[PDB]
């Protein structure tokens, strides 16, 4: 169908936009003097880089499922999504500690929370890919059900990161400080939309696609649609409002 030419365009424009916003963030690193909201900026740079990685990875699902592209998908998908949600979790934890009235974390500490929370997913993904490509049969003799089950089960730590970020961002809603509540509100909205999208495509891939007798014709389309849509949610519900808030300061 036309999903190979629409989504690719929706990828390509995204690849443009997440660069420009990246530039629109870097210049702000020369102009923001708050010492409390500046500490999140390297983490948001890493988040923008991970969104760019997601938009680039969408081509791996647009291009035919190959013995070359399957390790690329099975490694990069969970790793980049865990990087995004770990950056969101670090920002939400900084907001939790800021709304309560405590001194904000340094940017190095927030970057350590952003990177170290995504290292477990990196270890899991590299172990799975190395074991399949070395000890296994190089994805060759796997049924569509086996591949879908492995792809879903490989994302359990990412789902745990989603739930943890949801609860931590919800914890920002109470406290004596009110000017940090809007950042946590944006994070909460983004995580809720991401959770809804993830529930939708997991239910469609595991159960919806065999129900409509469209397996495995709809697997790569629903995963690519979910990838592009959630990357656009990351761009539009979190990054752009953060840019708007940081610009008027």
């Amino acid at each position, epitope marked *: 169908g036309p999903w190979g030419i629409i989504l690719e365009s929706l990828a390509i424009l995204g690849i443009v936009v997440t660069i420009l916003l990246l530039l629109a963030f870097l210049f702000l690193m020369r102009k923001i003097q708050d010492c409390s909201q500046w500490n999140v900026l390297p983490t948001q740079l890493l988040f923008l880089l991970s969104v760019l990685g997601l938009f680039g990875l969408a081509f791996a699902f647009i291009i035919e*499922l190959n*013995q070359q592209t399957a390790p690329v998908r099975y490694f990069l998908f969970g790793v980049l999504f865990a990087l995004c949600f770990s950056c969101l979790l670090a920002h939400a934890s900084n907001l939790v500690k800021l709304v309560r009235g405590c001194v904000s974390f340094s940017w190095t500490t927030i970057l350590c929370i952003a990177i170290g929370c995504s290292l477990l997913q990196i270890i899991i993904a590299t172990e799975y890919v190395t074991l399949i490509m070395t000890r296994g*049969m190089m994805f060759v003799n796997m*049924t569509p059900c086996q591949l879908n089950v492995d792809f879903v089960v490989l994302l359990v730590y990412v789902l745990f990161l989603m739930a943890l970020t949801f609860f931590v961002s919800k914890a920002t809603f109470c406290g004596p400080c009110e000017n940090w509540k809007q950042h946590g509100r944006l994070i909460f909205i983004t995580v809720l939309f991401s959770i809804i999208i993830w529930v939708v495509w997991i239910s469609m891939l595991l159960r919806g696609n065999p129900q409509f007798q469209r397996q495995p014709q709809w697997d790569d389309p629903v995963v690519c649609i979910a990838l592009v849509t959630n990357a656009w949610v990351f761009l539009l519900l979190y990054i752009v409002p953060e840019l708007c808030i940081l610009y008027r300061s």
Partner: antibody
Framework: QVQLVQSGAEVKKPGASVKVSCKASGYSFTGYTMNWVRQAPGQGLEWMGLINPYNSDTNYAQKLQGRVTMTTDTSTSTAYMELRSLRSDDTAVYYC???????????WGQGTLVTVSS | DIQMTQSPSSLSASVGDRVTITCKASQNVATHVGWYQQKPGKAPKRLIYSASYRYSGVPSRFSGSGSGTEFTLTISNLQPEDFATYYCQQYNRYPYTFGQGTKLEIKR
């Protein structure tokens, strides 16, 4: 779209070696494993081995090890199969079959007849 | 290796009849069974992969079913171009093994 074209039928002697080629077109040749399957006249299909064109890793059948050699050429995208020390029971039609993911042997060559007789 | 036995070796039927070919595996091969159709003088043609899925361009008359060590290919509405030799193949583990082949013949 996807096409696998082999060489012509060949007649050999029962002490020689045979090379069967398989030109692949219409797809990325590097990212798909190639099997070789032979069929005796009047008999069923018999699997011989595989080669991965990405790293030239081969896997042969137990009864054929020691005389079968599978190579690939990425520049021309052609898979070659060599059979040495031919016997009268090696007279068969040979097929190159491509393996894609989630599926089974979906694309086949037209078949090359090797006739081994003195 | 895994022995893959077909039943029957040859059966006769007419146009419009429904036929069933049974394939039995010595070991548990899950659902990693394909079905192929071969005409005299031509290469085998894909019919079924994963023991229940049809390739693109395969008519809906062919239907695969079964699991474990018991698999079944069913042709509902027989056609003159459907009379050929049918093979069941397993790809659960190497080496690949085929069936002996079931020849489909016109009954009169």
């Amino acid at each position: 779209q996807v096409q696998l074209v082999q060489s012509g039928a060949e007649v050999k002697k029962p002490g020689a070696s045979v090379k069967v080629s398989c030109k692949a077109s219409g797809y990325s040749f590097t990212g798909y494993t190639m099997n070789w399957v032979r069929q005796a006249p009047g008999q069923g299909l018999e699997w011989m081995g595989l080669i991965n064109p990405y790293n030239s890793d081969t896997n042969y059948a137990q009864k054929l090890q020691g005389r079968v050699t599978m190579t690939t050429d990425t520049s021309t995208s052609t898979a070659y199969m060599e059979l040495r020390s031919l016997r009268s029971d090696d007279t068969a039609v040979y097929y190159c079959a491509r393996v894609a993911l989630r599926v089974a042997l979906d694309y086949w060559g037209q078949g090359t007849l090797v006739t081994v007789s003195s | 290796d895994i022995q893959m036995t077909q039943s029957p070796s040859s059966l006769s039927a007419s146009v419009g009849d429904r036929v069933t070919i049974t394939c039995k595996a010595s070991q548990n091969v899950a659902t990693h069974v394909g079905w192929y159709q071969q005409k005299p003088g031509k290469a085998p043609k894909r019919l079924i992969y994963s023991a229940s899925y049809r390739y693109s361009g395969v008519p809906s008359r062919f239907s695969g079913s079964g699991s474990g060590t018991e698999f079944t290919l069913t042709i509902s509405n027989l056609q003159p171009e459907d009379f050929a030799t049918y093979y069941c193949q397993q790809y659960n583990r190497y080496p690949y093994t085929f069936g002996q082949g079931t020849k489909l013949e016109i009954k009169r």
